[PDB]
């Protein structure tokens, strides 16, 4: 019993976290109205896994988490659990028993630029895969070859991070798309957040 949730503080933010540094959020002790989500036409990716959106406001939850990042169109498909790809195996992946679901829409009028925009970058080279819901920050030089190289990069010693090059004149599947993924723990604790009753 309170006023409202900061839903517009995430979906309408100006700066969005990169792929390799996705940030959580503590949405709790608020009142959530999911009707306002249906406002942007290009919700071409609103497919929801744990619960059906139509019956989305008659029950409520224990705790929610709102991740967010910016990817390219081609990999929008590989956010669903169990996929394989260069971004779902080294940067971000979801558990097998995932609950909650994903919202994506195109944004090629804000996060893009005529000169370009080298502010979003991922990690392509890594020692191995990563466990679900895990972050990494280290920028140590990858050692591909069997030779001791420290600090200095080049052949057999690469820089793990590579940058996107977004430009307005690209095509669908190469433009930047924003992604927000939730997470619901359904009825295992006292209720915390829901709307009208």
């Amino acid at each position, epitope marked *: 019993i309170t006023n409202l949730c900061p839903f517009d503080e995430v979906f309408n933010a100006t700066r969005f976290a990169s792929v390799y540094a996705w940030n959580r959020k503590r949405i709790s002790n608020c009142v959530a109205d999911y009707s306002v989500l249906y406002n942007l036409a290009p919700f071409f990716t609103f497919k929801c896994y744990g619960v059906s959106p139509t019956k989305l406001n008659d029950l409520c939850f224990t705790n929610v988490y709102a991740d967010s990042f910016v990817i390219r169109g081609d990999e929008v498909r590989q956010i669903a659990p169990g996929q394989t790809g260069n971004i779902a195996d080294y940067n971000y992946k979801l558990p097998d028993d995932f609950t909650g679901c994903v919202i994506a829409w195109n944004s090629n*009028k804000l996060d893009s630029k005529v000169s370009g925009n080298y502010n979003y970058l991922y990690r392509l080279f890594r020692k191995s895969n990563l466990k679900p819901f895990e972050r990494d920050i280290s920028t140590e030089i990858y050692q591909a070859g069997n030779k001791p190289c420290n600090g200095v990069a080049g052949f057999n010693c690469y820089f793990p991070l590579r940058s996107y090059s977004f*430009r307005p004149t690209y095509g669908v599947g190469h433009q930047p798309y924003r992604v927000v993924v939730l997470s619901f723990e359904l009825l295992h604790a006292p209720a915390t957040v829901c709307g009208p009753k």
Partner: antibody
Amino acid sequence: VQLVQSGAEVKKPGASVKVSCKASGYTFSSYYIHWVRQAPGQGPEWMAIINPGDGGASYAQKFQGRVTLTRDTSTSTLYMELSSLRSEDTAVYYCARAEGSSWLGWFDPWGQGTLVTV
Amino acid sequence: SVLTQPPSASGTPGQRVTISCSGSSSNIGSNYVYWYQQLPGTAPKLLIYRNNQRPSGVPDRFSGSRSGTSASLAISGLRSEDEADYYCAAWDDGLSGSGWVFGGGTKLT
């Protein structure tokens, strides 16, 4: 408050040409510039986008690589160097004007045009 | 697409004739639609902004709108000075390339 073009003539096939139009009036570093070329018997076409200063440009598909684009601040000129000319590319060159710091919008007044034929 | 346009449109003085560009989704459905007017022996000029009221100044006789995947411009009060050609402009957001696909060519009498 207006844009002025240059003059040009016929160029031999399989060569390179230089297109430039001097600008005077509004601020130079706060307004995007569009390039369009118009061929007789049909409509015009879009060429590339310009961002004065840092000379960042973006090109379309069917005209990537073949087009070189340059800008500066002190001289206040736009350099448009086409390469590998063919007889199909006989058209007038128009340097346009845009909303300002936004590639999407209407068109401010165009130039008088420059014609090159192959 | 290519923004198919009627090849020509004739008329008589005092008669109201309407020209309309034909498009598809992601080109007329999503983004704005413009209208540019070109006179012979001159340079291309803009006629309208976003499909709405007149840009800066013109008789209110020039107006138009957009429905579904097409847009229309209504022209009345035909003069011999208004004999010209008109073009449509809109964003594309197509597959493998997205620029400023214009229209074709129309003849006015």
